[PDB]
Amino acid sequence: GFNSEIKEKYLDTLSEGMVMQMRPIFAKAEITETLYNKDIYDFTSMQILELIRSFDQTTIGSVRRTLALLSLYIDWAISYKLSKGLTNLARTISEEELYECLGDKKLYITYSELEEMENQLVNYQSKAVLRLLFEGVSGLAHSELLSLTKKQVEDAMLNGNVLTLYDSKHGERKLKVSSECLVIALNAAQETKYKLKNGKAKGQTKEVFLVENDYVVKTKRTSNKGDGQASKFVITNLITDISEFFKINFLTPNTIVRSGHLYRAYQLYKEKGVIDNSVRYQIIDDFNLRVKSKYRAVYSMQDYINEEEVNKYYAEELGL
């Protein structure tokens, strides 16, 4: 592409599979290279992030793989003193910064993405809102999530992981969830402090107090609301703080819930080869969704529960 001779020299050293991986990267990089009028090996770290973002990739995994290949090319270029500077600025990049490169095609998250994010989050309030929304504990006005108590979590733990949720408008509803979900919620329901900027605060105050109660989602004491149930704005703010840590713009209660549905669809698509209305029926049943007419909802789901989307996000898991 840009710097044809050098590129092809490096491609000669590769193993064809690697060459098939690199040809598209160099192709899509040509234009950023010609704009900056330099090769990738002289790019700065932020310029490398801008490049990878310009690839518009939908998973943190594909982003990690892309960065790795670029780092290999850069090591190569350093060894031959082609690079102006002699350090691999692609190696100085941190785990959160990669989420900047996730492009804007992305709307939904994969289960592996969820676990990685959770791992990077110091507060159990954050982990909990993410996980519980993923597994379907959202209600109308998030009533099922905001009324959730430690006792409900414990009972579920002693009940084959079946939560009895309370939506204020529609009433009671049962939901089987994972043990990870329940342990995370158990910790969240006992958390007394919340670390600002995901534990990377610069100023004098690093944490703030939460209210004293038995609810999983807890208001902050300063907010002047009661020591009882939290409002929907607490969930909005928790997700905002997460999005700011990872510098991403697609997270919404809706998209998280639907990511859960999509992951279930991926599993069933592996098991049974194709997604159809039986798969969608099964999803309605597993997440025990409130529907007036089953069939109306089955076809209403086709917009996001389909093969195009499952493949789009779960390709590598599919081995495609």
Numbering used by the authors: 1 to 320
Text of the article:
Bacillus subtilis contains the SPβ prophage whose lysogenic state depends on the MrpR (YopR) protein, a key component of the lysis-lysogeny decision system. MrpR functions as a master repressor of SPβ that binds to this conserved element to maintain lysogeny.
Crystals formed within one week of incubation, and we determined the structure of MrpR at a resolution of 2.9 Å by molecular replacement using the N-terminal domain (residues 1–105) of the MrpR Alphafold model and manually building the C-terminal part (residues 106–320). Two MrpR molecules were present in the crystallographic asymmetric unit. As MrpR elutes as a monomer in analytical SEC experiments, the formation of a potential MrpR dimer appears to be an artifact of crystal packing. As other proteins with a tyrosine recombinase fold, MrpR harbors a CB (core-binding) domain (Gly1-Lys84, helix A–D) at the N-terminus, a catalytic (CAT) domain at the C-terminus (Tyr108-Ala320, helix F–M), which are connected by a central unfolded linker (Gly85-Leu107, helix/loop E). Most of these tyrosine recombinases have been crystallized in complex with DNA to elucidate the recombination mechanisms in detail, while MrpR was crystallized in its apo form. While the CB domain in the MrpR crystal structure (in absence of DNA) is rotated by approximately 180° vertically and 45° horizontally compared to Cre, XerH and Lambda Int, the CAT domain needs to be flipped by 90° horizontally. The flexibility for the proposed rearrangements is provided by the approximately 22 residue-long linker present between the CB and CAT domain (labeled as helix E’ located between α-helices E and F), which is also present in Cre, XerH and Lambda Int. This structural rearrangement would also generate a positively charged groove between the CB and CAT domains of MrpR suitable for DNA interaction.
